[PDB]
Each structure stands twice: as C-alpha cells, then as structure tokens.
Amino acid sequence: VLTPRECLILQEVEKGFTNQEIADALHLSKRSIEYSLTSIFNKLNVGSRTEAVLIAKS
Amino acid sequence: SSSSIGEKINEWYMYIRRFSIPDAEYLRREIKQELDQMEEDQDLHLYYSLMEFRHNLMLEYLEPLEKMRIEEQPRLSDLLLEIDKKQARLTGLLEYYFNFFRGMYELDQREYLSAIKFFKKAESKLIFVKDRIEKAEFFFKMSESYYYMKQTYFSMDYARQAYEIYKEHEAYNIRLLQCHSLFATNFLDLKQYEDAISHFQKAYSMAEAEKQPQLMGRTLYNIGLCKNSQSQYEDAIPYFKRAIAVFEESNILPSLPQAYFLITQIHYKLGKIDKAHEYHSKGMAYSQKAGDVIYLSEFEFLKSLYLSGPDEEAIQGFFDFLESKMLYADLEDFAIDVAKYYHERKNFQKASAYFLKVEQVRQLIQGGVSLYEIEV
Ligand SMILES: [Mn+2]
C-alpha cells in the first residue's frame, strides 16, 4: 500500500520523468528517489520501471 | 514544542517501518531543522539519534535489493523482522521512547485514556532503560502526569517508586525533595492537610540545605496554601510572608504575582483592609510587570468582590474567562468565595445564588474521555 507521497513518485514515473527530474520536482536527492523506487517496486512486486508503470495502471 | 517534536519522530518511525522513503526523508529533514532551532532535552536528543540511526539501517537493508532480480528480493515485511531481530536492543529502546512521547503528546491533547495506554506500553519497555536514574525519571514524570489527571493514588504510587530510587543516590537530594512535594500536593487533594504540611515541611528543610531559593519559596507558599484551604487564614499569613521575602530577595519575578494573591485575599476576608490594599497594590503591580494575564484578572476580581459592591457584572465576566480557560477548580473556589462574602454580609439570597453557581460549575465535564473504537 503506497503512501500518497509514494504514489506521487509513481505518478511522475508514469509521466516519463527521469529520477533526476523526480528529485527536482519533489526536493529529494536522486539517491532518495532510487531508494524510493527500490522500495516502491518491491511493494508492487515488479522488476522494472516500465512494469511498475503497468501494475500502477491496474 | 518538545512534545510535538517527539510525536513527529513517532510518525517518522511509522514511515521507516513501512520503508516509505519519501515520507521518512521529509520528516527526517523537518525534524533536523526544528531541533537545530532549539535546546532539546536529553531524552528528545537521544530519541532523535536513535531514529536517525534506525533510518540509516532502513536504507542499508534496502540497498542489496537494488541489484536483485525481483523474485530474489525478500518481502519488505520480512526485512523489518530481520531488522528488529538483529537489533533487539535498539528496537526496545525505540519502543520505549515512541510510547513515552506519544503518551506525552496524547496527554497534551487531553486524550487521557489514550495517554494511559501509551504510558503503560512505555513502562513495559522500561527494561530497555538501563540507568536506574532514568527509570526514576520515568516514574517521576508518571507521578506528575497522574497528579495532573487527578489519579491521586497512582500519582502517589509512582512518586514512591521514584523516591525509592532517588533515596539510594546521594547527588539527587533535589529530586527527593520534589518527590516530597509530590506526596504533599497529593495529600492536599485528599484533604489530608496535616500530612501535606508535614511533607512540605520536609521539602522545605531540604531546599534550604541545597540553598535553592525558588523551591524554598514554593515550599513555604504551599504550607500557607494548606492553611488557607482549612480556612486557617491567620495561620497562613506568616508562611505567605516568608515565601514572598524569599521570592523578593532573589529576583524570582515569575513567582510573585501568585505569592501575593492569597495573602491579599486573606486580609480582605479578615477585614484588615488597609493591609489588604497594600498587598493588592503590590501584587497587581508585580502581575503587570511579569505580564501575567490570569493574575491580573484575579487581582481585579478581588476588587470587584471585596470593594466594589460587589460588582456582579465584572465578576460574571471573570467567571466566564476562567471557564473558557478550563480553570475549573479556581472557578469553583472563587464562586464559593463570592457566596461566602454575601453570607457574612447577611445577604442570604445572593449567597444562595452563588452557591448554586458552584454546583453548576461542578456539573461541567472537566476531563471527559473517549473510548477507542468501542461499539454502542
Ligand atoms: Mn538543538
């Protein structure tokens, strides 16, 4: 179950942002975005950015 | 506020246990900034340091998953168990502070049932707090908290537990003294006036040893308060006088509006009006200086009652003020004072009316609670 802020990260991912662009948009370090995705992807049980986008959309 | 910072650290921990990185990072940052703008107590600084370390552990356990294919990655929920298992002492300490600070926050929000529930969880984690002085400090804080919630028996019980530990150390005579103050104020709520006095006297002798002006003064004041509560007005005067002298020699401005108030009122009640007037003038001035909102109105009230007729319209505004502030105990007491003023003046209709006000006030919900998720 994603927090609203984690969903926000995913929303930016779905729009095609890069990690750096997500960092800048949310005032987090890029490293933090990387950690966030590792956590988020694990939670969605996916192994890729593209595939996280798909499970997101369902 | 120390209390609000601790609760933010609590929220931080909840996000950490969930591995919600953005949330944890935002709180981590906001908490660092807030603590950089204050001299936090030792307990709060330690809780933060623990949580900072725990946050880094969160990141450290997540790091290996980056290079793992997804099917080779453990569920986060299991990662968490591993962390708690390999860091049992950290976890226990975190549990202690989390619950202690949440409890303090709930108490602050006047959520009493909720505060007790967290205080009990904290106490069950006290085994992780090695230093026996730190344990005593917990018991001491519990005592103060149940004094405030008026669970008088539990307040004394915790004061006793704290006292027992302080008694075994020599450098803690001040805390011992304050345990005596805790016994005394509790005895006072129980109407055990002689017992209260006796403990205030003990506390006094100890504060005099430690050459502690503030405590010395408060102790003397409390004795006068006990005398006053028994309507032994003449007997209270010398104690209020001694307390004032102590407060005034040192420059303990904050304590002075109060130290002057009861003694002012007493002289009104005793019909010593020129003396009342002088105490009044001085007490009023001290209150003006310290910028003490409450005592300004209370000194004002003395005039409204004892000199002004009485001035019932001004008295009524004052009563409303107190109530809006939830100073119910004082409100009851002042209404009684008004009733009694009229009674001695043989104005029984007016006395009866204020005695009725007293009962109305005693009917207010003064510390209501709410059950958590219990069905009706
Ligand atoms: Mn600081």
Author numbering:
A (entry chain B): 153 to 210
B (entry chain A): 6 to 381
Sentences from the paper on this structure:
More specifically, ComA drives the expression of genetic competence genes, while RapF inhibits the interaction of ComA with its target promoters.
To begin to determine how RapF inhibits response regulator binding to DNA without affecting its phosphorylation state, we solved its X-ray crystal structure in complex with ComAC to 2.30 Å resolution. RapF consists of two distinct domains, an N-terminal antiparallel 3-helix bundle (residues 7–72) and a C-terminal tetratricopeptide repeat (TPR) domain (residues 92–381). RapF-ComAC contacts are mediated only by the RapF 3-helix bundle and linker region. First, RapF buries ComA DNA binding residues in the RapF-ComA interface, sterically blocking the binding of ComA to its DNA recognition elements.
